[PDB]
Amino acid sequence: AKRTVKMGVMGRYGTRYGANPRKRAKKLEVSQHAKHFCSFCGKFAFRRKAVGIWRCDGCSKTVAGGAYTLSTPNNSTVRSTVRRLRELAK
Amino acid sequence: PREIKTLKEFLAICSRKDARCVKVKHNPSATKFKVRCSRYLYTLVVNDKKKADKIERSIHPSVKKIAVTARSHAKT
Amino acid sequence: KFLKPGKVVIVTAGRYAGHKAVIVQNSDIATKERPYGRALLAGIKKYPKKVVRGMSKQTIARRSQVGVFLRVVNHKHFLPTRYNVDMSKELRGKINVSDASKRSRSKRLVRHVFQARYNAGSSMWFFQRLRF
Amino acid sequence: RLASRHEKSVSRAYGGVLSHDQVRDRVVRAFLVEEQRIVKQALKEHSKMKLSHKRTANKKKS
Amino acid sequence: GKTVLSCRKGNGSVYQVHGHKRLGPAKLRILDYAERHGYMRGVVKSIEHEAGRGAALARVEFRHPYKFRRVKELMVAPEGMFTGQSVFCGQKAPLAIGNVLPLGQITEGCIVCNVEAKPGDRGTLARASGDYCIIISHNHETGRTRLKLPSGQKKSVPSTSRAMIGIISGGGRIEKPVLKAGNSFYRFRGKRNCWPKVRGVARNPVEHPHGGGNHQHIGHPSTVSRHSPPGQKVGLIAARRTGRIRGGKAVKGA
RNA sequence: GCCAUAACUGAAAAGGGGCAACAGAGAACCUGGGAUUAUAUUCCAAAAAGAAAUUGCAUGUGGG
RNA sequence: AAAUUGCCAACUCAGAACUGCUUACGGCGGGGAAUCCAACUGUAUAAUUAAAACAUAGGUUUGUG
RNA sequence: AGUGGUAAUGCGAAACACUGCCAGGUAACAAAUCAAUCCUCCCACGGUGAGCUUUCUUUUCACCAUAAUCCACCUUGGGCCUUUUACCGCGUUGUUCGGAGCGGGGGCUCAAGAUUGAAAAAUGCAGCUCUACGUACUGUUGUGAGUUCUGCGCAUUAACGCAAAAACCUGGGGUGU
Ligand SMILES: [Mg+2]
């Protein structure tokens, strides 16, 4: 069946720590333990090892970046900026 | 300790200078020729009781033969 | 199509990993007791060393010896190169492998031909060692 | 230390250091990365000599 | 009458860093001739965690310029740095994420990290996890680059000082609540002895200027001068303004 | 033309010594004993009760 | 339809008649309605105070390129 | 101047001999789950001795041992090779895997054991029999329960990511040429 209503992974903590600090931690505890997309290897296999360290379980590629999610949204703003600025020099 | 396969290798070991004593152990099934050389103890397991006594006669001249018995506590 | 006899390959698997080899005979279709595509390779077991000025002859002549192998290898265990070595149509007729003594007498023949390519200086890429 | 070399190695290149799936991935890139530069080096000398008769052939045109 | 705890941490005895499980210092490779004129290429072999950082490290492998050897180089990584990447390093290096090239060569409006405040000191600015500097402008009369530091405080640096390109790795870290004093035990485990933090009002008057009384109150105003001696300079040191900041966001610093 | 043994010339090795762990690293021996009043994986002598492992150095035999 | 003939271990649960109780080792929460205070687990006056104190996560401020 | 096998990789009486320089690996570390080694406990087989017996008990209790070191090589967990290509399939108690090669068919290896032997019966123990720490003989199962040895890690909760070095090992390159 379905085991809890809306405390998902945070049911670990019981009736502790306040309702909303469990919810700010919930979006990032789900994110770091979810398997992300290996754009190198085509698979959904990036699991975070340590903080900022990700590893494709299919491709054995180790990617630095992002504490709780593989690519932080400030990175994709930077990757587009570098890609644009190397087109103006070629 | 090692183990001799054939009889052509047993007579080479008993010809050696380090071979102090061959100990002869009569099991109820086989016999054992335990050559005590300076590092290893070489054993030839002869399963046939008639071929065993023929092998004892070929190590007559100048190697020490010992009939292994059960030495009691009183010899000490 | 492109795996013609007389073509330099580089052996990618086995005890001869990374050695150059030329294709002698070729079998693109699989068969019983060798259920795979394959090629009779005649490669270099031991490359000739470099000689410098100062070395005497009988030191140059010993350092410039090629050693060969003559041996059937699966097609996925070598890597074909655009480079070629002119295996004539009359020379691979003299290379038998389906014997024990006519594989020894055919390995001395390949060793003599590669030595003649090496002393004449033809196809000097084939006699350079692949450094990985 | 007391064992033979064969319990600790294997008969090919980098034996006892690298495995079969990556001895070959170095043989393949020692050929393909050397030969890719030869394609780009010989393209470079073919370009500079075509420049050596794009303008030196303009000595007979004015 | 006794010495304040903040004065005692400068003896640095029980209060030094917890460095036994730390890797080496993370810095850029040596500004040699090979980067003043050309590029050195490396290759990323491993992405590493050391205790007491939130940003990922990286060992990059160069060849030594002068000897037949290879140099293991522990750099702090940007986001997107993968093992195998072939970092380039020097003057003629291109403009890509992970590369390290002088600030004169990086066109304006570009996010950079591991930027160095003087040429050669191997990276001193923008190294905490998720931080970056933005290049505002170049001046070719003076030969200096003016960039925006992660606090917003601008700083003009020489244009021969090099920088890596990217966000610092390991970003997004402070946005998750700790929830436990247990999780703050292990956060400060690989750093140094500075936790739990006892308030000054909870102390006796012998230990701290705020301590004592029958109610836990600071008696005097808690904004102390810049010229206060060590022991007296506790509280809000030289506060230009206090209170809940209602309005914009002033950059903090001199 | 390979060694190896004795005395001149000189490539190449940046970063001086020594401590700190009888619970970390490292470490070649195991039983039997009628062998004690008391010690033993420590003593046992030609059938070492015996079976080994290991280090240094040396002869001989054999191989390059 | 090996969908069935042979042989065999190690335990557990449920059901059923029949019969007895002197309620009979050891071990093992009393429960409920509210008010005050501190969110919580934790620390803490060795030798009279373990608390509502202290810590804590969380919140804010200040100094600093 | 080593050499077999398409290949995973094999072959050691003494040349498959040596190491300025280089690079790796070993030392070198990690939960819980399940499976679990030595060993312990129990049960089952029996043999020897002992204890109980008005009655009962094919009975109760004790014992039944095998050290290192070699040598030759049936399982059940890893890795892989080759051949058939499969994009639902294989598999775990369990959170998953596969065209970046699943599953079959043949293999190559590694790790933990099992087995035959040399040691080793000559030893050990308990009995007992004969004319003095004396002798001659007699005996040497288990789909049970517990076991961290192991499987086992790029291996735990983690804003926790889990020492180092000596010593050694293999390669690269060189010498032998
Ligand atoms: Mg475990």
Short mmCIF file of C-alpha atoms (C1' of nucleotides) in Angstrom, two decimals, chain B residues 1-3 23 25 27 32 34 43 45 68 70-74, chain H residues 68-71 117-125 133-135:
data_model
loop_
_atom_site.label_atom_id
_atom_site.label_comp_id
_atom_site.label_asym_id
_atom_site.label_seq_id
_atom_site.Cartn_x
_atom_site.Cartn_y
_atom_site.Cartn_z
CA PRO B 1 57.81 -33.84 3.91
CA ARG B 2 57.90 -35.17 0.37
CA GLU B 3 56.94 -38.44 -1.31
CA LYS B 23 62.80 -45.93 8.76
CA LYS B 25 57.09 -48.81 9.01
CA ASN B 27 51.33 -50.75 8.20
CA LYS B 32 56.63 -47.10 4.27
CA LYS B 34 60.94 -43.04 5.33
CA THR B 43 58.51 -41.63 1.98
CA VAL B 45 54.62 -46.17 -0.01
CA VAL B 68 59.74 -48.53 13.43
CA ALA B 70 55.94 -48.44 19.35
CA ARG B 71 58.49 -47.25 21.88
CA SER B 72 56.91 -47.28 25.33
CA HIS B 73 57.15 -44.58 27.98
CA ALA B 74 59.69 -46.64 29.94
"C1'" A H 68 52.06 -26.87 11.20
"C1'" U H 69 54.27 -27.86 6.32
"C1'" C H 70 53.76 -29.98 1.54
"C1'" C H 71 51.43 -32.67 -2.76
"C1'" G H 117 47.93 -38.49 -0.45
"C1'" A H 118 53.16 -37.31 2.32
"C1'" A H 119 53.28 -35.90 7.70
"C1'" A H 120 50.59 -39.70 10.90
"C1'" A H 121 50.97 -43.81 13.79
"C1'" A H 122 55.17 -44.75 15.42
"C1'" U H 123 51.29 -39.99 18.47
"C1'" G H 124 46.91 -39.21 21.90
"C1'" C H 125 42.98 -41.13 25.18
"C1'" C H 133 56.40 -44.62 36.74
"C1'" G H 134 56.54 -53.29 33.81
"C1'" U H 135 54.37 -55.65 29.54
#
